[PDB]
Design a protein around this ligand. Structure first.
Ligand SMILES: *[C@@H]1O[C@H](CO)[C@@H](O)[C@H](O)[C@H]1NC(C)=O
Ligand SMILES: *[C@@H]1O[C@H](CO)[C@@H](O)[C@H](O)[C@H]1NC(C)=O
Lengths: 163, 109
């Protein structure tokens, strides 16, 4: 019933990577290219992408809903243009999670004029636990997360009416 | 490889070990990229270890993931690998089916 959006990893913490140019034409805000608000699209900076070894220790008294993703280009040319490392991965680990993603480069139809595909994953960190990301490319890193401050009894209603 | 020679089925357990850094890989396995290929009359399974940094549970960060299968009579299983192999040392013959259940209870006998 209640989410508390907190900044686990600040966009001001990405200095060895370009963390302000990861916009797209497919999500226009005020008719200008932009991107999701709660996740950051890391790209190469000065044609170099040293591995991200990031980590976060869930210090609150509750659980945390952490979102991240992976970007699949449509050809190795876009890989090099977006990431110097030509074969990449994202390794995520917690007290339970164990997940090593690899991007699937393929040719495919254009949706919203964009062929590349972003696939987002999610998990819930328990109190007093930690999450560990590592990667060398294609990392749609989290910029925000959600504290689960109030459980309850609820539902999701597929309806069209107004309030 | 093992040829299931009994007249019944067999419950075979194995696993794979995921270290937490390539240093532990080399310390535990000279081969830096490994795999486990398992095959039967039905199974076809090629595992690769996922090296990642993660929390310590019981002070141990590495994670073991165990798989299971059931060999039919007169059939065979074939393991191949070059690292991270938690090999089976024992298996279970299924000698008596029946009607049973699993009860989540706390009482004593
Ligand atoms: C998170 O920090 C606490 C210190 O308050 C520590 O005890 C705990 O071990 C840390 N998490 C992990 C997974 O080590
Ligand atoms: C297992 O051994 C029997 C011999 O008793 C043989 O006929 C059978 O083909 C073997 N299993 C396989 C998968 O070849």
């Amino acid at each position: 019933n209640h989410f508390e959006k907190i900044q686990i990893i600040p966009k001001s913490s990405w200095s060895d990577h370009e963390a302000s140019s990861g916009v797209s034409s497919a999500c226009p805000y005020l008719g200008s290219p932009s991107f999701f608000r709660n996740v950051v699209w890391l790209i190469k900076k000065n044609s170099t992408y040293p591995t991200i070894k990031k980590s976060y220790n869930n210090t609150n008294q509750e659980d945390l809903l952490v979102l991240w993703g992976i970007h699949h280009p449509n050809d190795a040319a876009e890989q090099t243009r977006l990431y110097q490392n030509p074969t990449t991965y994202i390794s995520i680990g917690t007290s339970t999670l164990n997940q090593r993603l690899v991007p699937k480069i393929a040719t495919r139809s254009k949706v919203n004029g964009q062929s590349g595909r972003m696939e987002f994953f999610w998990t819930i960190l328990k109190p007093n636990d930690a999450i560990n990301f590592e990667s060398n490319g294609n990392f749609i890193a989290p910029e925000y997360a959600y504290k689960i401050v109030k459980k309850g009894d609820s539902a999701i209603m597929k309806s069209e009416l107004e309030y």
